[PDB]
C-alpha cells in the first residue's frame, strides 16, 4: 500500500562533557535501516537492515559525511536555542528533528515533512504546502525569519519531493522481501479469574507487521471502548509487533464478549470468543 | 569573518609549519586551497564538522585536524619547494545560502637554501621640471629592488600620514632576471601630486616597503646582514627649484 | 561537474556595460557564486545566487542563473578601471555529501581608463639621494598604447598602471623604465614599444 521514509535526530547537551550526544536513525515504514551515534567508535553511518548492506562505499561515505554535518549543525543549534530562551549553560537540553516523505500505493509523492522540537515541544515545522513555516512561540519567530530569508523551504521541498521519494522507491525494491510484506497477526484469548464473580479476558495479537492494527471488544454486539484496557503496540524485537486488549467481565458471561482484530495482513477481520 | 595566519612565511626545505584558519560564524564547513599559475584553485583538505576531515584534490604533503568548530589548521610536516604557493582557507554553512567565505590568503615560499633571501633596497625619484611645467602635476616614483622572495607591501606617506589618492603601485613585481626560477624582484610605484604641492619645501614624502623575511630561529652565519622581516624606506622633500 | 568561463579574457573601455559568462555541466547545484580576484590579492565575493532563485543585484553588479540551461551571466554596468580583475564563478552540489565547490578558471577583465586629454610624454626623474641614478617615466598616454618589455637584458620596464587624483577628477596611465646599463637613456627606453608619434621628449 502506502509507504514512508523518515529520519529522526536527537541531540542532547551534556554540561561538563566535551561534546553533546547526537543520535540519528532512519526508517522505511516501521523498519529501521540505519543509525549513527556520535559517542560510538566508528563515527560512520551504520546499517541496521540487511537490505541496506547492499549499498556500496560511495553510499556509506556520503551518508557518513552528511550525518556528521547534521551532528555539527545540531551542536550549534543547542547553543543558539540556549540563547533564544536565555537559559544557563548548567542545564541539559534536547533538540529533535524529523523529516521524510510519504508515497501512495503508486509509489508517487504524497506528502513531505520537516519538524523540529526543543525540550520536548514543537518549535518549528514545515507546513503541508511545503512553502511556509509554523513557529510555536516567540523564540521560533527568529528561526522562521531566518529560514524565510534563506529560502530554506524552497531548497528543502526539492529533497522531499525528489530525492526522498526516489531513494524510498529504491529501498522498497531492494528490500522487497522485507518491506513489501505483511505478517498477519497470530491471535488468541486468555482467561484470568479476578474476584469471585469477575474474570479478565485478554485478546492477543502477535507477530504482526506493519504495526498498524485495531483491537476492539464487544459485549453482545456493542462496543466496549470505555471499559477496554489497551496497551501500546510494542516491538517483539524480531521485526514484528504485539498488542493486547482486555476487559473484566462477570463470571459466567464470558461467551457474551467478542474480540475483533483488524490488520492489513488479514483477508477479513477476525472475531474471537472465549471458549471453555 | 575568516582569519588566517601568517600572511607571509619563508621556510627552508624540511621545516614544518602550520597555517591557521579561524572563523567566528559557526560555519560547519571549512577547507584549504592552494592557488598556483596555470593550475587554478586546488582543494587540499576539507571538513564538514568537528571530528571529521577528508582529502581534496591535492592532499599529499599536508595534514589537517578539526578538533573545534572555529579552527581548521593546515600543517606541513616537512616543507618541500613544490609547496611554495598561496594558500586560502574557505568556510561556509552546510545549509542556508551556502555562501563561501575566503580568508585573506597566506603566501609561503619554501627554499633549499635561505641565503637566497634578500630585503629590498628602496629609492625615491623626484618629479622632473619638464613634467611640472608641461602638466602642472608632479609624479614621484618609488623603486623597491633586489628582494626575494616576493613578500612586500609598499605604501606612501606624506607629512607622516599614509595616502592612497594619486597612487598606483604595480599589481605584481617583475623578475630582475626573467630566465631564473629564483630571480630577485623589483616593484615600482607612483605618487602624483599638484605642482604646487611638490614645490613646497615643507612637504615630506616617504615610500615605505614592509618586507617579510627570516625570523630569529633561522640560521644565517653569512657576512651580509640577516634579511629579517623589516621596513625599508626612502624619502624626498618638496623643493622650489 | 565542469565549470567553464568563455571568453577567458575581456578588454573594455571605461563606461561600457559588460557581460561575463559562466557554464556548468551538471544542473543539480545548490548555489552559484561569483568572485573577483586581483593579482597578488585574495578572493572577494560579489554575488551568491541560490539554485531556487533567478537573480541577484549589488550596485552595478547583477547576475542571472539559468539552472536548466546550465549557465549564469554576470552583468557589470558602467564599468570602471577598478573593476579590472579576474572574475571566478563557482557552484556547489545539491547532493553527493562532499559539499565541495567546483570553480571555473575565471575571466580576466581589463577596463581601460578614459583619458580625456592625452598628453604622452617621457620624463627623466633623478634619485632624491643622488642625481647619479634615474628612472624614465612614460605617462599621460591614452588606452591605445601598450607597453612592451625591453629587448636588452638588465633593462626593467613595468606595465601601464592607472592612478587617480579624485579631488581633481583626473586619472592617468604611466609605466616606468630603468637600468644600470650605460647605453640606456629615456630617449631609447621605450624603443621596443609602439608609442604615440607626438610623444613629448623634453631635452
Amino acid at each position: 500500500g502506502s509507504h514512508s521514509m523518515r529520519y529522526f535526530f536527537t541531540s542532547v547537551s551534556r554540561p561538563g562533557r566535551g561534546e553533546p550526544r547526537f543520535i540519528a536513525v532512519g526508517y522505511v515504514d516501521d523498519t529501521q535501516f540505519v543509525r549513527f551515534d556520535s559517542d560510538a567508535a566508528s563515527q560512520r553511518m551504520e546499517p541496521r537492515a540487511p537490505w541496506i548492506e547492499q549499498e556500496g562505499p560511495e553510499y556509506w561515505d556520503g551518508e557518513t559525511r552528511k550525518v556528521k554535518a547534521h551532528s555539527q549543525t545540531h551542536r550549534v543549534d543547542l547553543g543558539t536555542l540556549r540563547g533564544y530562551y536565555n537559559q544557563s549553560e548548567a542545564g541539559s537540553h534536547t533538540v529533535q528533528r524529523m523529516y521524510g516523505c510519504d508515497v501512495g500505493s503508486d509509489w508517487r509523492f504524497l506528502r513531505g515533512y520537516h519538524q523540529y522540537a526543543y525540550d520536548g515541544k514543537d518549535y518549528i515545522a514545515l507546513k503541508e504546502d511545503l512553502r511556509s513555516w509554523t513557529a510555536a512561540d516567540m523564540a521560533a519567530q527568529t528561526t522562521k525569519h531566518k529560514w524565510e530569508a534563506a529560502h530554506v523551504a524552497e531548497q528543502l521541498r526539492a529533497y522531499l519531493e525528489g530525492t526522498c521519494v526516489e531513494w524510498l522507491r529504491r529501498y522498497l525494491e531492494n528490500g522487497k522481501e522485507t518491506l513489501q510484506r505483511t505478517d498477519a497477526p497470530k491471535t488468541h484469548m486468555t482467561h484470568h479469574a479476578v474476584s469471585d464473580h469477575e474474570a479478565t479476558l485478554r485478546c492477543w495479537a502477535l507477530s504482526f507487521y506493519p504495526a498498524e492494527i485495531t483491537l476492539t471488544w464487544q459485549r453482545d454486539g456493542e462496543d466496549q471502548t470505555q471499559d477496554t484496557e489497551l496497551v501500546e503496540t510494542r516491538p517483539a524485537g524480531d521485526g514484528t509487533f504485539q498488542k493486547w486488549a482486555a476487559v473484566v467481565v462477570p463470571s459466567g458471561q464470558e461467551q457474551r464478549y467478542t474480540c475483533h482484530v483488524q490488520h492489513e495482513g488479514l483477508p477479513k477481520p477476525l472475531t474471537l470468543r472465549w471458549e471453555p | 569573518g575568516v582569519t588566517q595566519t601568517p600572511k607571509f612565511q619563508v621556510l627552508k626545505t624540511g621545516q614544518s609549519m602550520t597555517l591557521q584558519c579561524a572563523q567566528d560564524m559557526n560555519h560547519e564547513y571549512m577547507s584549504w586551497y592552494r592557488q598556483d599559475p596555470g593550475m587554478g584553485l586546488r582543494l587540499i583538505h576539507y571538513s564538514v564538522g568537528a571530528g571529521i576531515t577528508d582529502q581534496g584534490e591535492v592532499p599529499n604533503g599536508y595534514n589537517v585536524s578539526r578538533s573545534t568548530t572555529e579552527d581548521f589548521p593546515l600543517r606541513l610536516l616537512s616543507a618541500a619547494p613544490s609547496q611554495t604557493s598561496v594558500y586560502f582557507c574557505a568556510s561556509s554553512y552546510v545549509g542556508n545560502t551556502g555562501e563561501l567565505f575566503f580568508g585573506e590568503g597566506s603566501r609561503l615560499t619554501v627554499l633549499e637554501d635561505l641565503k637566497n633571501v634578500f630585503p629590498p633596497e628602496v629609492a625615491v625619484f623626484e618629479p622632473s621640471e619638464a613634467e611640472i611645467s608641461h602638466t602642472q602635476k608632479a609624479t614621484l616614483v618609488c623603486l623597491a629592488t633586489g628582494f626575494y622572495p616576493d613578500h612586500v607591501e609598499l605604501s606612501w606617506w606624506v607629512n607622516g600620514k599614509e595616502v592612497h589618492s594619486g597612487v598606483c603601485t604595480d599589481p605584481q613585481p617583475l623578475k630582475e632576471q626573467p630566465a631564473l626560477n629564483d630571480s630577485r624582484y623589483a616593484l615600482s610605484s607612483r605618487l602624483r601630486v599638484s605642482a604646487t604641492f611638490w614645490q613646497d619645501p615643507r612637504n615630506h614624502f616617504r615610500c615605505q616597503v614592509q618586507f617579510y623575511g627570516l625570523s630569529e630561529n633561522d640560521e644565517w652565519t653569512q657576512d651580509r646582514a640577516k634579511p629579517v622581516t623589516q621596513i625599508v624606506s626612502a624619502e624626498a622633500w618638496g623643493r622650489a627649484d | 561537474q565542469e565549470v567553464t568561463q568563455i571568453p577567458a579574457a575581456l578588454s573594455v573601455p571605461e563606461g561600457e556595460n559588460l557581460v561575463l559568462n559562466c557554464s556548468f555541466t551538471d544542473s543539480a547545484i545548490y548555489n552559484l557564486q561569483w568572485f573577483r580576484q586581483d593579482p597578488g590579492k585574495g578572493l572577494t565575493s560579489l554575488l551568491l545566487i541560490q539554485s531556487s532563485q533567478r537573480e541577484q543585484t549589488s550596485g552595478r553588479l547583477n547576475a542571472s542563473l539559468d539552472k536548466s540551461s546550465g549557465r549564469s551571466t554576470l552583468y557589470i554596468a558602467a564599468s570602471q578601471p577598478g573593476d579590472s580583475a579576474t572574475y571566478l564563478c563557482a557552484v556547489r552540489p545539491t547532493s553527493g555529501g562532499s559539499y565541495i565547490p567546483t570553480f571555473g578558471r575565471g575571466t580576466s577583465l581589463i577596463v581601460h581608463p578614459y583619458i580625456q586629454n592625452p598628453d604622452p610624454a617621457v620624463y627623466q626623474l633623478r634619485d632624491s639621494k643622488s642625481s647619479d641614478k634615474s628612472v624614465c617615466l612614460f605617462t599621460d598616454f591614452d588606452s591605445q598604447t601598450n607597453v612592451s618589455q625591453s629587448k636588452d637584458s638588465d633593462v626593467y620596464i613595468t606595465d601601464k598602471c592607472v592612478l587617480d587624483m579624485r579631488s581633481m577628477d583626473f586619472k592617468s596611465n604611466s609605466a616606468v623604465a630603468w637600468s644600470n646599463k650605460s647605453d640606456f637613456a629615456c630617449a631609447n627606453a621605450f624603443n621596443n614599444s609602439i608609442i604615440p608619434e607626438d610623444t613629448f621628449f623634453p631635452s
Binding site: 529520519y7 551518508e63 549543525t73 531566518k146 | 552546510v94 | 545548490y30 547532493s95 553527493g96 555529501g97
Partner: peptide
C-alpha cells in the same frame, strides 16, 4: 538517503 543541506535554527 539523508538531506544534504541542513540549516541552523
Amino acid at each position: 538517503s539523508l538531506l544534504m543541506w541542513i540549516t541552523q535554527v
